[PDB]
Amino acid sequence: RKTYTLTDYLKNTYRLKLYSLRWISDHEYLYKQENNILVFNAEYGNSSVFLENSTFDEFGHSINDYSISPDGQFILLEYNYVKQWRHSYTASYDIYDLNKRQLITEERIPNNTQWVTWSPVGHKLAYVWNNDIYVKIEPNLPSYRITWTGKEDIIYNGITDWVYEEEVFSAYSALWWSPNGTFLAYAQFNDTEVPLIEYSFYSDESLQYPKTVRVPYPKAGAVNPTVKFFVVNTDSLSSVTNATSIQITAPASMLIGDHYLCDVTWATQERISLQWLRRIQNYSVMDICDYDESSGRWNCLVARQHIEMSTTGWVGRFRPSEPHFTLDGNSFYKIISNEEGYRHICYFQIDKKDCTFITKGTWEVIGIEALTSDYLYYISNEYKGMPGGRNLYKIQLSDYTKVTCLSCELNPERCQYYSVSFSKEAKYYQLRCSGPGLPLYTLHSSVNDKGLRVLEDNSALDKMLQNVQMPSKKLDFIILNETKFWYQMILPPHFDKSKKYPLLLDVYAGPCSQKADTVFRLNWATYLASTENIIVASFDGRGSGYQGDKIMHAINRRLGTFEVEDQIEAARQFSKMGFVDNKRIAIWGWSYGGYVTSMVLGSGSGVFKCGIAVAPVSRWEYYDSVYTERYMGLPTPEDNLDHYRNSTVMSRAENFKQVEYLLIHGTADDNVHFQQSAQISKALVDVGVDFQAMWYTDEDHGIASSTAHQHIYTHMSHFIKQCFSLP
Amino acid sequence: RKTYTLTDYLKNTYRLKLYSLRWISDHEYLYKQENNILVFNAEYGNSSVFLENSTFDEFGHSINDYSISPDGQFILLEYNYVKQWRHSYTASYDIYDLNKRQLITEERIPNNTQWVTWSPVGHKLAYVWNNDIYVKIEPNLPSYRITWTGKEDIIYNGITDWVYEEEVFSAYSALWWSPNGTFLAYAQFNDTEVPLIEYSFYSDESLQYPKTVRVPYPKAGAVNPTVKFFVVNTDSLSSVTNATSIQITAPASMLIGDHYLCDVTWATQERISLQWLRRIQNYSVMDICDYDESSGRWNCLVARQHIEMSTTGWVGRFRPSEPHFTLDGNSFYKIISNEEGYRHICYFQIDKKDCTFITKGTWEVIGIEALTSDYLYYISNEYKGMPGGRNLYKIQLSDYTKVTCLSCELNPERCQYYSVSFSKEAKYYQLRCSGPGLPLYTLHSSVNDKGLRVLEDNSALDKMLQNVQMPSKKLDFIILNETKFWYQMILPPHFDKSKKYPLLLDVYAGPCSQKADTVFRLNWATYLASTENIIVASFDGRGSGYQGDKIMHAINRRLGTFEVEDQIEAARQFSKMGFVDNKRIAIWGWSYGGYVTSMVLGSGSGVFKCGIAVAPVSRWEYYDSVYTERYMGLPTPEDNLDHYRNSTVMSRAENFKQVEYLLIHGTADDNVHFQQSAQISKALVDVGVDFQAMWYTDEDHGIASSTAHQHIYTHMSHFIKQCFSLP
Numbered sequence A, B: 001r002k003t004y005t006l007t008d009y010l011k012n013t014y015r016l017k018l019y020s021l022r023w024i025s026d027h028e029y030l031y032k033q034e035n036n037i038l039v040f041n042a043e044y045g046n047s048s049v050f051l052e053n054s055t056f057d058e059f060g061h062s063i064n065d066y067s068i069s070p071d072g073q074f075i076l077l078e079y080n081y082v083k084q085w086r087h088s089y090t091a092s093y094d095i096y097d098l099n100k101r102q103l104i105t106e107e108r109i110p111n112n113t114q115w116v117t118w119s120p121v122g123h124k125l126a127y128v129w130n131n132d133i134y135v136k137i138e139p140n141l142p143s144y145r146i147t148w149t150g151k152e153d154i155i156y157n158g159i160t161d162w163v164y165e166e167e168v169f170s171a172y173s174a175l176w177w178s179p180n181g182t183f184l185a186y187a188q189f190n191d192t193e194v195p196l197i198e199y200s201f202y203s204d205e206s207l208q209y210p211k212t213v214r215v216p217y218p219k220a221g222a223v224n225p226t227v228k229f230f231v232v233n234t235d236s237l238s239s240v241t242n243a244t245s246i247q248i249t250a251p252a253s254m255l256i257g258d259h260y261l262c263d264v265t266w267a268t269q270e271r272i273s274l275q276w277l278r279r280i281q282n283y284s285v286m287d288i289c290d291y292d293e294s295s296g297r298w299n300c301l302v303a304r305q306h307i308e309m310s311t312t313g314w315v316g317r318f319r320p321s322e323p324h325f326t327l328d329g330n331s332f333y334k335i336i337s338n339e340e341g342y343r344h345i346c347y348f349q350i351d352k353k354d355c356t357f358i359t360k361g362t363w364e365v366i367g368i369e370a371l372t373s374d375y376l377y378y379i380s381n382e383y384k385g386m387p388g389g390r391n392l393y394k395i396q397l398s399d400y401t402k403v404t405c406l407s408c409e410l411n412p413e414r415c416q417y418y419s420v421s422f423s424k425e426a427k428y429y430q431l432r433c434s435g436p437g438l439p440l441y442t443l444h445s446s447v448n449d450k451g452l453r454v455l456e457d458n459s460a461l462d463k464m465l466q467n468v469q470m471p472s473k474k475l476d477f478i479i480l481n482e483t484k485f486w487y488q489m490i491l492p493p494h495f496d497k498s499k500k501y502p503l504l505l506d507v508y509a510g511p512c513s514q515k516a517d518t519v520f521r522l523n524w525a526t527y528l529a530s531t532e533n534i535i536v537a538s539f540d541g542r543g544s545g546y547q548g549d550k551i552m553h554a555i556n557r558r559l560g561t562f563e564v565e566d567q568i569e570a571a572r573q574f575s576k577m578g579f580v581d582n583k584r585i586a587i588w589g590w591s592y593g594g595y596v597t598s599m600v601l602g603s604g605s606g607v608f609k610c611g612i613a614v615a616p617v618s619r620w621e622y623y624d625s626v627y628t629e630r631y632m633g634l635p636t637p638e639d640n641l642d643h644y645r646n647s648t649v650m651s652r653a654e655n656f657k658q659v660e661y662l663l664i665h666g667t668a669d670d671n672v673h674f675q676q677s678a679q680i681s682k683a684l685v686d687v688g689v690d691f692q693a694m695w696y697t698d699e700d701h702g703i704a705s706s707t708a709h710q711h712i713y714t715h716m717s718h719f720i721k722q723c724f725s726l727p
């Protein structure tokens, strides 16, 4: 048999298969296969061809992505894709009728549009061009302007600014249609007083002078952007006079200082939910607002207002959890950590402030996925008491003791990590199994809860991997200060406990992480074990997620303390197990893991020989406000400046004398500025420590352009092989 | 026994001694002992003690450098020196009185002062502050304001912008007293439409948002700064009425296009000479310009225009040569390249304009050092047909054929490399022998040409060095195309000719460079030969200078051609001598030889195992217009675009596949911008070539900071050691 090699991973020799589908009705879904968008049927297979390989064959453009209007007439066609940050990007748009086999020509959508969306019923459009919002009742009719305020790097109507895209909404889009599209809600951010990160972009070598990029980006302690919120009524627009947009202003609990808007969620045709959140992120307020068909303004009755606050840390996991209303929009289920530290479902009622918990236990609820008039469906890590694994549950709404696993025992040895995807009224759901066996995608009915057929079993792949010498995964735990803490090892094949193999520690360890899980992946780590016989290990100690607040909030206000000491104390444990060479212990990480790699090599620990750190944070005052202050407070004397300063990589430069270090960064990293590593290399130079570094011209935080991607992973390969002595 | 070590070199153990002085009369001069300013009579001994190793403990501030008034009465004092480009700085300035031992308070010279200088006779003063000229007649009294155009980054009055500073005057100063102190001329530089290089400066940990530095800088082709000249007189100044400057405008041979000011030289109290050079630098014009007691303006008579031009290449070694004038102002001597392309001395008489040559042969006048009614004194490389060497001669104005060498046989073994400084009217002079033996400082008398005393012979060092296994040096040549080309080698202690050594090839190789000399050096090569046993060898090939124009102009319009060829050629010669190990041959170099080293590695000859390039130029359109265009012409397709594009390091990427490369660059390089290396790296990553790289945070083109000077020489030494396989 052959061994998994570095090239298999770089030329992507052994591809996993998956089954991407869209639902479009309670009965039906879509699936391109050979570029043929088919329409599949859920009960039988009465299935039909919706769109040809070709058709658009003669577009003389690459169709970047597609979208159908939910009434079925039209299709949106996206191309000329030009990326911005993580989720943001600018594109060109053309619409196509399917009852007329024809494409629109008039009032078409202006090139370089920031975002496009359909209403949920019918075929109206909302789009954002040049920071402003536009609406199109019908695709061919002129477009209704809605804002004027929009200005590049100042005002943003209906799109997120830099920081709200990254660490709040995870989206560029900041619009929300009502259920039938009557209204359109939106958001407005203001960066006027927010300062600019500046950096260089070199480009094609043809370019003579290098460009500076200026991005409004508020670092810890700095002036942040502000947020306003409105709802406009789409069903009465005027050819003649402007559009009146009703502001639903925040509550006074929030208006007294820097706050954030963190959630927008419709309940009914005329009832919307808001969540807000103070800059000090331990205090959140929800608000339920009804339409007044007398004054078309919007009421949010203080009785219906809902508080959520934290005594042990910060509200939500990354943000306040999201509420799921019952069809009358008169109660709602929602994730809220109970009073033992564990995250479970609460059933609220629009007008009463106690909630009633419908789940109990030492395990957490990952997500509410769906809601009928007799069942709620949710995802937990309950099965066999493992926080690394995910499974699907339904709960009988007339009797909270009547509760049922639907995935656990379909096939428990191959399958332990499930997502679920629902038909438009939970008549059906697809299930996705990510591991530990080979992904298994399958289809089910909610009535019988009986599975109709297999969609994809990853068999092509199965057959090749009988040809490959492959690694093995212990997942298990160990006990400390009285507590279980999960790790995973990737073990080379024919792995023999006699022998003392070398050990790379793959780290992340930032708040609410999990690196110890039931998932199946072929990755770098697989190559190192398969081909270099290196044990790859990960470890979720304090800070880590899905195991309660007692374990998530340990690091609150004290980042770069317990997550570092825990990575170190787990390496100790691994040495003492004695199939590990206690002189060949290395460590690596990226982003937050690169920081923690950097703090651990700075620690004077004795334990590690080699380190590699990729776009690491080195000093929290350099990261942005919204992520940083959530866990750190504000960097003033009056609050938490002191930990801010003890917690910097720079203060540890002299101890790298004891280790071999490698430091890599993109020159054009918007997220964690090159600044951050600049400051590290400088401190190590000024106390005379030798070390290695690669810059990567013009890459960002992902370093994911194909060629940079082959370089880095090779370069790091050479460094590990080199320090471990592998020939 | 012990050897010369990286640490001796970095920590600067074995120090030379120089004997600097300041002639301040025809027969007296200053100089420190420790902390203490003596004046020394020349005839015999009088020491006088001009100032004390105390006196200035009084002062508070951290004094820096001193200047004295011609009439000997005042002394100017520098502090808060705050470093800028390569000659440009800012400082503060207090004036002490020497007759009193008082200190001027009422009306001083403000902080952040840019340049300041005494007139040549008496106690008159001119300075520049926010780009404006100011004169003081008396140091106790109210400054006179000369210009009001000055403006940061656009208008430079009495001082150079970045291009004139680096590439023409090698000076921040652009003022010119008349010899008796009356008139004062200055240059005004414009920079309105010169575009702007932009780069990051991180400063201390404590700075939260980096700083973007913005500097006006023309690259190849770009828009240059234009230039204007003026004379103003200093006896007729008015305190009611603003102060008049007379323009003197360039000749119309120059005015039709882009052109530069390349030299300013006063001949009489009322006659000035101005040299102009075209943008395309194969054509210069000299003007000679008398006063006019009646009009008040300056008259540049056109019988007195001397046109120097070129056809093999460019005018000058790097610019037009300077004139030395006959006391009366009516004739001058100037070095010019003759009909066979050797530089020698020409007598000109202002009205007739064919110069007569005073010297000839197959060797070259380095420079003209002094003029008496009787003799001309010059430095040259004639002695023994050796361009490496340097020696002082004198020639009789009454009879050319009669020329004495003042330095040749003085001390023939130890001393072949001379420089000189004469007293106010050439009665005495100091000699400076800088190699091949230890440096040796002496005093001489004109009338006798008498060897008065030895001022310093460095025997302190001489003892020390008899404890160490010092390397040895060979200087010598080879013959290519029936022409001599000089190499020097640094050879290890107890060099054994039957052995194989690895070989590093130090490189510069720029136009009119010279690496093969008889100078004496303690440097990184010293360390590499004595301690790690490497032969370190440089080579003076095509382009190199002081050997005339057939060799020098060979690269005309054609950089990165022959000089690269010849660097490979030289390494090939050396390996066939049979004490070289064909498998271990490196190359490296900073600045120009960074480029030359890159292009060698990128050439795919295979002769070089590995290489290191420090701050290289990778592509000529990234470099400044003045130096670049001087050797390439213009990057238009109606001039030299095709070579500009063929001569890039980046188009040689796929060959770096046969080599271990190490690329290094200061992030704040204001000259060769980090731009240049960024494009190299990107190129290599694209074709997939492993290399190693290092940035230096906020260092510039020198990487001179104490700690970084150390970091890089240590990093580089490791890299070579890897490559030659040495511990």
Ligand SMILES: *[C@@H]1O[C@H](CO)[C@@H](O[C@H]2O[C@H](CO)[C@@H](O)[C@H](O[C@H]3O[C@H](CO)[C@@H](O)[C@H](O[C@H]4O[C@H](CO)[C@@H](O)[C@H](O)[C@@H]4O)[C@@H]3O)[C@@H]2O)[C@H](O)[C@H]1NC(C)=O
Pocket: B149, B155, B190, B191, B192, B193
């Ligand atoms: C340094 O160099 C600068 C240019 O590089 C120079 O500034 C002159 O040039 C700028 C271009 O940057 C010009 O804008 C300006 O001159 C012109 O200004 C107007 C254009 O915006 C134009 O209307 C003017 O013409 C008018 O007035 C003149 C008389 O004043 C008449 O000839 C015209 O008919 C018309 O009525 C004018 O041509 C700048 O003067 C800086 O001055 C220079 N600084 C130095 C030398 O100190």
Ligand SMILES: COc1cc2c3c(ccc2cc1C#N)O[C@H](c1cc(F)c(F)cc1F)[C@@H](N)C3
Pocket: A166, A167, A168, A169, A170, A318, A510, A591, A592, A616, A617, A627, A671, A672
């Ligand atoms: C907006 O929501 C999220 C943001 C998340 C983020 C996560 C990791 C998980 C997240 C998960 C959610 C969620 N859900 O990590 C990101 C992150 C954290 C770092 F320390 C860092 F150096 C770079 C970086 F991108 C951070 N900027 C945003």
Ligand SMILES: COc1cc2c3c(ccc2cc1C#N)O[C@H](c1cc(F)c(F)cc1F)[C@@H](N)C3
Pocket: B166, B167, B168, B169, B170, B318, B510, B591, B592, B616, B617, B627, B671, B672
């Ligand atoms: C204006 O005067 C000079 C400038 C000189 C210069 C010399 C080398 C010798 C010089 C000699 C003189 C003289 N004389 O080289 C310098 C130089 C050349 C390069 F290719 C480069 F990348 C950087 C660099 F500083 C260039 N900036 C100016």
Ligand SMILES: *[C@@H]1O[C@H](CO)[C@@H](O)[C@H](O)[C@H]1NC(C)=O
Pocket: A149, A155, A190, A192, A193
């Ligand atoms: C955005 O905020 C800025 C503060 O600089 C203010 O001047 C401007 O009026 C605001 N724009 C709005 C809210 O329309």
Ligand SMILES: *[C@@H]1O[C@H](CO)[C@@H](O)[C@H](O)[C@H]1NC(C)=O
Pocket: B148, B240, B242
């Ligand atoms: C000198 O000229 C400047 C600017 O051109 C002007 O402001 C000033 O009045 C003049 N100075 C005096 C003292 O008249």
